[PDB]
Design a protein around this ligand. Sequence first.
Ligand SMILES: Cc1cc2nc3c(=O)[nH]c(=O)nc-3n(C[C@H](O)[C@H](O)[C@H](O)COP(=O)(O)OP(=O)(O)OC[C@H]3O[C@@H](n4cnc5c(N)ncnc54)[C@H](O)[C@@H]3O)c2cc1C
Length: 296
Amino acid sequence: HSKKMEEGITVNKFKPKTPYVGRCLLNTKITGDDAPGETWHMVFSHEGEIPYREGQSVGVIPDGEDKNGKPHKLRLYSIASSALGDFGDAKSVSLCVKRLIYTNDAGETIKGVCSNFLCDLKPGAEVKLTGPVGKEMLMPKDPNATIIMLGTGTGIAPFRSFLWKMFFEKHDDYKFNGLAWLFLGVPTSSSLLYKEEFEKMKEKAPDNFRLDFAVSREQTNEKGEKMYIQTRMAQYAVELWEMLKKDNTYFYMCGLKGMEKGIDDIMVSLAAAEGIDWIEYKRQLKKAEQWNVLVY
Ligand SMILES: Cc1cc2nc3c(=O)[nH]c(=O)nc-3n(C[C@H](O)[C@H](O)[C@H](O)COP(=O)(O)OP(=O)(O)OC[C@H]3O[C@@H](n4cnc5c(N)ncnc54)[C@H](O)[C@@H]3O)c2cc1C
């Protein structure tokens, strides 16, 4: 029995040995020039060949060979579009990709293989895809569920997928009527991803959608602390902790590995304050499919 929309999902229809070859339709930079690092939203054509569901990922095999002449390893990317897609016809898939650039030991600049291949794609270019992959980030079956979403950076991807389904589409068998609450933590205002879309959703379903942004380098709390995602969340601690006590509440976290630790630190304290061991409570929540995490 599952609390998530797991029935009839498709997994690994396309594999690394036999990828699906799609084509780039659009590739747009969605962060301002201010932003530390660039993030691109790209859409690929798949002609209905990849039957994915909100919350899943696709693997991308970047062009070229590794230092051993073999083809590159695949890299996974959460799908940023709902099942119907940005165009509403179930024939395209969209990704949210941050261009990775770092420096090695010798002080030389190294560009990440797959992220740079992807952000450099031009409309018409082909791309090898695999998947769909995953069950961890699927949506709850319950249309009246309280869904709390916490993402950092590109971790916004699966939540854009969820929200398009919930607020931008009409479905024969699904009408969301619960409360969705999104918290998005980014470094700069120029790094807010998809804010415009979220703002329109908010106007559309003001009683079903709550929205909170945490711009670390630009906002501080009373003590004067940087506005990290948990720093903005602690401001609603009593409310969220009370929400976690209910059976119809589902927590999803996605983004940079770091975030996991800082939320756990806030939680351990709220729980102990009520005589609860967070480590055991979290375990029970994970078992009940109420605590869902995907960090990388
Ligand atoms: C399930 C899942 C979902 C994901 N979803 C997304 C998504 O939606 N968007 C997205 O952008 N990414 C996502 N990723 C990350 C993505 O898979 C790639 O890892 C990422 O894009 C970088 O890969 P690359 O091929 O560009 O880099 P690679 O060429 O593989 O380089 C990565 C290597 O760079 C090194 N490195 C990185 N930073 C530094 C540093 N500061 N100093 C030194 N070494 C460093 C690390 O050793 C790492 O092994 C996801 C990953 C997973 C597992």
